[PDB]
């Protein structure tokens with residue numbers, strides 16, 4: 001599995017290239033894995049992935065929450081890996097064929113797929129939560145090795161970890177701003193995803209350092 | 219929304235030159251183009267303004283928005299800043315995520331299209347069972363634009379029943395995925411067509427052919 005430094009992944013959702021680059025550079029000594037999503041990509045272009053690789057020695061996870069039909073999912077994954085992303089996040093709710101499409105491209109291109117099971121926000125309780133355990137089981141059956149689960153719901157994250165097993169890799173967003181606790185989340189997740197708590201801080205480096213200090217024993 | 223010929227072109231080619239050439243070849247038949255991630259991630263968001271400059275067509279961004287509220291807001295802002303007139307949003311993530319998109323759309327003078335049931339086989343696993351409820355959620359939220367499957371006319375009809383005849387409904391899955399143009403228009407206001415047109419030997423002839431088959435509609 002990817003070796004995430006300090007078990008901490010930066011969710012870089014600033015939409016300004018200059019700010020995104022500045023903040024990421026400031027926390028570079030604490031984090032070697034960065035998650036770039038559509039807020040930044042739709043604002044600055046896919047080349048931003050290239051720029052991050054050039055400026056920082058960081059792995060890139062594209063949080064594109066892929067959720068289209070198989071044919072379109074394949075195109076999205078191909079374009080994303082072509083740009084330099086090490087991995088891509090894919091939604092499981094659209095079904096097995098949509099996920100399989102992403103897995104096929106990842107296999108062909110030598111990259112990885114992370115399957116998003118349950119989401120961390122309140123609305124996730126309406127439809128996703130009830131399908132989450134099955135979505136996770138589906139991922140296991142499809143051979144998915146990397147997963148994304150909610151920090152905001154410890155009990156749900158715990159169940160997801162059981163379903164996927166100890167060998168699977170699990171990362172979890174919702175830490176900080178959304179209410180999730182770093183240490184508690186790491187009881188089940190291999191790494192925590194943190195965005196606003198770090199990038200909106202007056203001193204992002206200090207914020208990252210503080211989070212790492214709180215989980216030093218882990 | 220007045221869609222010419224009730225036909226929306228799904229421009230999923232991933233080359234700027236080809237995307238522009240093919241769209242130009244069928245411009246006389248359409249005035250509404252749906253641009254998705256295949257083209258945007260390959261050529262950049264500047265392609266939206268380019269389409270408006272060359273064709274003056276309306277642009278629907280098929281971005282299947284499906285993140286948390288905070289991120290959905292940012293995605294909608296970046297999308298509308300690029301010149302998109304409307305954006306497609308997934309309903310499965312819940313009401314708060316949809317509301318976030320509705321807020322930005324209202325602020326920038328745009329429209330949100332709520333995707334309730336998808337057109338591919340995998341949609342039967344989790345989405346289909348929640349589709350009717352997702353549609354009712356849209357109604358409760360004041361959504362007036364929806365997306366339903368051409369591949370399942372009975373499901374598309376049910377969606378129309380739930381949202382009423384005043385709501386606007388567009389439908390993908392026509393052609394390549396097996397959906398029929400005319401049957402789909404019994405329930406949807408407009409059909410979305412991608413590959414049947416952009417992968418055709420003669421895109422213009424393909425578009426003309428589809429329109430001929432629905433001339434009476």
Ligand SMILES: O=c1ccn([C@@H]2O[C@H](COP(=O)(O)O)[C@@H](O)[C@H]2O)c(=O)[nH]1
Pocket residue numbers: 011012013037063116118119120121149150173174175176177178193194195196197285286289
């Ligand atoms: O269930 C999910 C899946 C993805 N994210 C993403 O993870 C990051 C969380 O950032 P923050 O709340 O720490 O600022 C964002 O990029 C967000 O879009 C969630 O928050 N929850």
Ligand SMILES: O=c1ccn([C@@H]2O[C@H](COP(=O)(O)O)[C@@H](O)[C@H]2O)c(=O)[nH]1
Pocket residue numbers: 068069072228230254280333335336337338365367390391392393394395410411412413414
């Ligand atoms: O349930 C859905 C929602 C969206 N699309 C999109 O609509 C277009 C259909 O294109 P095609 O099958 O006519 O080529 C594509 O852009 C695809 O991603 C579907 O096909 N089904």
